[PDB]
Design a protein around this ligand. Structure first.
Ligand SMILES: O=C(N[C@H](CO)[C@H](O)c1ccc([N+](=O)[O-])cc1)C(Cl)Cl
Ligand SMILES: [Pr+3]
Ligand SMILES: [Pr+3]
Length: 387
């Protein structure tokens, strides 16, 4: 009678994702309007992502105790408020803090929204819902930059946050009528001390931590590209929004192509073999982008080629490493998931800032060299992690 639930959670998820991806290309208009330096462009995403790791560890056990409905709806509202509130920001510092506060809305998708999905639907229907969510996450970083660039060509950046709030508002009402209460520990006491002990315990698991760290390092080059390609292409290479948008296609296309191959190969390949398989394009790609731009600072097409090859590798290898990492720890999936979520966003957050300084100080060469060491760190962890 009511499938409005998973569909509205999907719409919310989509909106928090363009909440990131549509904004990055817009950030050039943003810093122009505040008369802030281009160094604040990538920090927009850093702050957004830092918000995404802020309440991770807490929302799951909390929504288990007080209800999935109140917590989930609260997150959607928080998203609406913080999106609107950024229109009143008076300087880039204030703009960035709000990016952070908006980012907290991310924590609600996995820890409480998705947990409600698992506690509602048949193990078969739940698979198709998760498939749709994965498609959304795969399409957002492709569509976002393109839509974002075409948006600021005709409309003010403030408009984008109105769009995000509107979409999430639609999504609020759909969840208000169709989301069931599935929390199993309603009324039970939540102990922050026991929660801390849970997390101290998961982190002592060496094999788990290596896999979690590896996921962060390996995805970092992709996130660093999202954060910085606007300043790399437009302000750096003196190119237009058209080239910026176009260079996105081979990169996230290859990501998609990588996940598609993974779909076809999975019945005749173990997770272990697909990771080793992905390792070749992951490494070759990063190597190519680094060598080329060391050789020639402005070889941005070689750079895009390298990153496409790398992105294909990620498509093939990551989901399998996610699975192994999840099952490398025997503790509650809520706890294990939030732990691996926080570990990798720690790497993204710090990594984008280091990346930004690499590019500001040494240009494309440094940008790509830093990406290469991240791949090497993944590779290093995989030699130990695989057995
Ligand atoms: O980097 C990737 N994404 C993962 C999730 O699979 C990463 O943890 C992530 C999560 C959220 C996000 N966001 O909404 O801005 C970005 C990256 C790709 Cl490997 Cl799919
Ligand atoms: Pr306990
Ligand atoms: Pr416990």
């Amino acid at each position: 009678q009511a499938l409005l639930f998973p569909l509205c959670l999907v719409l919310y998820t989509f909106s928090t994702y363009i909440g990131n991806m549509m904004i990055q290309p817009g950030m050039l208009a943003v810093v122009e309007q505040y008369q802030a330096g281009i160094d604040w462009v990538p920090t927009s995403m850093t702050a957004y992502l830092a918000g995404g790791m802020f309440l991770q560890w807490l929302l799951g056990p909390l929504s288990d105790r007080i209800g999935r409905r109140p917590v989930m709806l609260a997150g959607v509202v928080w998203f609406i408020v913080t999106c609107l509130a950024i229109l009143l920001a008076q300087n880039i510092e204030q703009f960035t803090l709000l990016r952070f506060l908006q980012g907290i809305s991310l924590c609600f998708i996995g820890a409480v929204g998705y947990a409600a999905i698992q506690e509602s639907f048949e193990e078969a229907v739940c698979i198709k819902i998760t498939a749709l969510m994965a498609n959304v996450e795969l399409i957002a970083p492709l569509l976002g930059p393109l839509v974002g660039a075409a948006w600021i060509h005709v409309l003010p950046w403030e408009g984008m946050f109105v769009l995000f709030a509107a979409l999430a508002a639609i999504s609020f009402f759909g969840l208000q009528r169709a989301m069931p209460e599935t929390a199993t520990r309603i009324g039970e006491k939540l102990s922050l001390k026991e929660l801390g002990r849970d997390y101290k315990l998961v982190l002592k698991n060496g094999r788990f931590v290596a896999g979690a760290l590896a996921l962060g390092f390996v995805s970092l080059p992709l996130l660093a590209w999202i954060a910085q390609s606007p300043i790399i292409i437009i302000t750096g290479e003196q190119l237009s929004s058209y080239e910026y948008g176009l260079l996105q296609v081979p990169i996230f296309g290859a990501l998609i192509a990588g996940n598609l191959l993974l779909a076809r190969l999975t019945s005749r390949r173990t997770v272990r073999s697909l990771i080793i398989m992905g390792g070749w394009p992951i490494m070759i790609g990063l190597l190519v982008a680094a060598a080329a731009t060391v050789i020639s600072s402005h070889a941005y097409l070689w750079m895009t080629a390298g990153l496409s090859i790398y992105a294909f590798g990620i498509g093939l290898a990551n989901a399998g490493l996610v699975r192994l990492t999840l099952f490398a720890s025997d503790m509650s999936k809520g706890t294990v998931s939030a732990a691996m979520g926080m570990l990798q966003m720690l790497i993204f957050t710090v990594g984008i800032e280091i990346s930004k300084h690499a590019w500001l100080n040494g240009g494309n060469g440094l940008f790509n060299l830093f990406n290469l060491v991240n791949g090497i760190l993944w590779l290093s962890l995989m030699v130990i992690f695989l057995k």
